[PDB]
Amino acid sequence: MFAWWGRTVYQFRYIVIGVMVALCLGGGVYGISLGNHVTQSGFYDEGSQSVAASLIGDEVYGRDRTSHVVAILTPPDDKKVTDKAWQKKVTEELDQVVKDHEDQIVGWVGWLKAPDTTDPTVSAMKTQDLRHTFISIPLQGDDDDEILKNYQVVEPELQQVNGGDIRLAGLNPLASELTGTIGEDQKRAEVAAIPLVAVVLFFVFGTVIAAALPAIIGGLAIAGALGIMRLVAEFTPVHFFAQPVVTLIGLGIAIDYGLFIVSRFREEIAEGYDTEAAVRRTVMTSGRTVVFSAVIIVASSVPLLLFPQGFLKSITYAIIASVMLAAILSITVLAAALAILGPRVDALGVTTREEVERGFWGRLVNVVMKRPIAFAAPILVVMVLLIIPLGQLSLGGISEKYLPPDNAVRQSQEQFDKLFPGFRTEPLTLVMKREDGEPITDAQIADMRAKALTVSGFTDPDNDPEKMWKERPANDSGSKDPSVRVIQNGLENRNDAAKKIDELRALQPPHGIEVFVGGTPALEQDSIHSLFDKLPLMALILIVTTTVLMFLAFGSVVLPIKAALMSALTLGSTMGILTWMFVDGHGSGLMNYTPQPLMAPMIGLIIAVIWGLSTDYEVFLVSRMVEARERGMSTAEAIRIGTATTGRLITGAALILAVVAGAFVFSDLVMMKYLAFGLLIALLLDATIIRMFLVPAVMKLLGDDCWWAPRWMKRVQEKLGLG
């Protein structure tokens, strides 16, 4: 089947490059403007009962908006808030701002609206020393995106007031700071990537055109990637995190494909088969290797679709689309370009030994394959060494803890938390709804109050059981349905909540009313439980698909079993070492980050990407080995020539992703640096260890019994004809 495709691609010749370049540039120009519309409420699981409870609560009572913006204010020049003339300036300034933005801001809430007050809540608005006071600036909106987009436009006008002596914090400043750090990362990305990719391409080739071509190929492939993700975003919203990383990862991995192309054609010119059919061969081998890589990557990324995480689904869509488009379009354009330009690659040059290294590599391989036990025991000890960290795991949620302490916004947030205690809380929501729809009797409310009170472990500020479980006050933006009601109260320790939430789920309300449990801890617990339940089945389906496609590619079962165990080993190893190195040593101080319980969808996608990359290196090695076996030489000759012919190519492929991972770790956000550490350490250490020692030593044991296969295991191999 590949012969026909190769014949068509080298008969199409010239005009195809022009039409494809025109199409991809048009798509890129159309897709430049896709970052305007993004979503930020997509990390919540929609199938959980807690989110449904929250939706019913905000439908009946209206969404709360006092926690979006909190402003710490302090009078300067050693003057307290007692002076009556001081607050006049602040009130006039904020009144002018809200007048300028009456549609954009409705008003303000704080201590200044009524100095004389008897409310226990408003008296606490003012501190003991009469120095710092916090005010609340509500923002309107049906959901979060309009809230945030009206927030940044008033960000500077609200910040400048009182001569720049106000400290703003809340949920919206955090989102604005993530937008700012993504913007600076985008500014840094290309300008830091181009010199490093240029120098590594100069190192591996040293030819100006052979290095300039992949740079253009990556740029044209990413344009199509963003175009395809825009088309798929037209139906389903896409979270911001899909823009800065995934595409470039595509770019990163895409380079590898192009690298191999622009590599092997070169060595073909060392041989000698002519410009016309140079493509002939190179296209066949490039096509087979890229289709194997593409199908295995998409098969590794597809099992995550079963997860109901919308953000994770968007990431999987983006990565699958980028890999597919990069593979197909890049192989087409490079094949046609090498057909057109011909063998004159080494014409311009910079003006516009190696045998000893090969012998050393052969000696290293011989030493490796001579003694397999003294390095087999290190495998077991490092297995234990990676299992030991696995006990130390903690999972949490998204908060301000991610942001580095250097940013002034977290400094303001932590100052507010430290000096002003107890104002920010995340109480659980216990929803009562009636099937009939009749108004809820106060007797039933008291009964449910008692049933929720009978269990301990809750926080009571003024030490009387009666006033606990206070009803949610009704905001003026919700329709008060008497058939549905909610109550809430705070908690002391986040960890014990799963028990308290579980017990609240356990209790039996009266027959007439039915109960929802919700809140910020309930959604986290539901997500953790769901992923813990669906992890083994996802791993099983992933491993069976991987091994069945490995069998479909070339054959044999011992090699796929070794590959499966190898992938399990590497995914355990990288996770264990990345969770250990930060804990045992004070390595967090150098990169300036703090401990925090990791959240699970991201580590799942990291497992997916390390799976893909390690297994892609494995299938590259296996494909070259089976090519050598089809040549007809012995196993030792095949192993040595396989190491010799592509050690430099594998090293360059590893260096590309090491360079991009460095480019990411120069960023500021901690979670991104965490995933960059994971992928970098995995690729570098594990790939070096497997290529240098593990693979040659382990592939020497079985022998001829490895290639043996049942009759129906070979009939399907000869029938398909794809390989």
Swiss-Prot record:
> What's the miscellaneous note?
Binds antitubercular compounds N-(4,4-dimethylcyclohexyl)-4,6-difluoro-1H-indole-2-carboxamide (NITD-349) and 1-((2,3-dihydrobenzo[b][1,4]dioxin-6-yl) methyl)-6',7'-dihydrospiro[piperidine-4,4'-thieno[3,2-c]pyran] (SPIRO) with Kd values of 0.05 uM and 0.8 uM, respectively.
- The part of the entire sequence present here spans 1 to 752 of 1013
> Quick one: effect of changing residue 659 to G?
Binds to ICA38 with a dissociation constant (Kd) value similar to wild-type
Q: What is the effect of changing residue 657 to V?
A: Binds to SQ109, AU1235, ICA38 and rimonabant with a dissociation constant (Kd) value similar to wild-type
Annotated residues that bind SQ109 are located at 616
Show the ranges annotated as biased composition (Basic and acidic residues): 464-483
Q: Name one GO biological process term.
A: mycolate cell wall layer assembly
Protein's recorded name? Trehalose monomycolate exporter MmpL3
Record topology, Cytoplasmic segments: 1-14, 262-290, 560-562, 623-649
Q: What is the effect of changing residue 609 to L?
A: Binds to SQ109, AU1235, ICA38 and rimonabant with a dissociation constant (Kd) value similar to wild-type
Give the Periplasmic membrane side ranges.
Answer: 36-196, 239-240, 312-317, 394-538, 584-601, 671-674
Annotated segments matching region Disordered: 456-484
**Localisation:** Cell inner membrane; Cell septum; Cell tip
User: Which keywords does this Swiss-Prot/TrEMBL entry list?
Assistant: Cell inner membrane, Cell membrane, Cell wall biogenesis/degradation, Lipid transport, Membrane, Transmembrane, Transmembrane helix, Transport
Per UniProt, a 1,2-diacylglycero-3-phosphoethanolamine binds at 40-44
Q: Effect of knocking it out?
A: Cells lacking this gene are not viable. Knockdown or depletion of this gene leads to accummulation of trehalose monomycolate (TMM) and lack of trehalose dimycolate (TDM). Decrease in mycolylation of arabinogalactan (AG). Accumulates MSMEG_5308 protein.
A GO cellular component annotation in the UniProt record: cell tip
